[PDB]
């Protein structure tokens, strides 16, 4: 009964979603920190990073490109 619903949806459904990108992972902080809790993320959220930039040192400077 919607045969062309669906059709033209799927094509605006795309770009109707622009929004829920950034609601999405706003929702999800606004929501977790709602709660009374007395927790500690942001010291394994420094480590991280360490571990980000001692892997990408390895692989961009090995791996070398110019005429293969």
Do not use: C, F, P
């Not at 009964?1 to 609601?23: C, F, K, T, Y």
């Not at 902080?29 to 007395?38: I, M, V």
């Amino acid at each position: 009964s919607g045969i062309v619903q669906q059709q033209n949806n799927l094509l605006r459904a795309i770009e109707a979603q622009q929004h829920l990108l950034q609601l999405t992972v706003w929702g999800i902080k606004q929501l977790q920190a709602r709660s009374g809790g007395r927790g500690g993320w942001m010291e394994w959220d420094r480590e991280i990073n360490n571990y980000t930039s001692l892997i990408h040192s390895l692989i961009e400077e090995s791996q070398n490109q110019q005429e293969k």
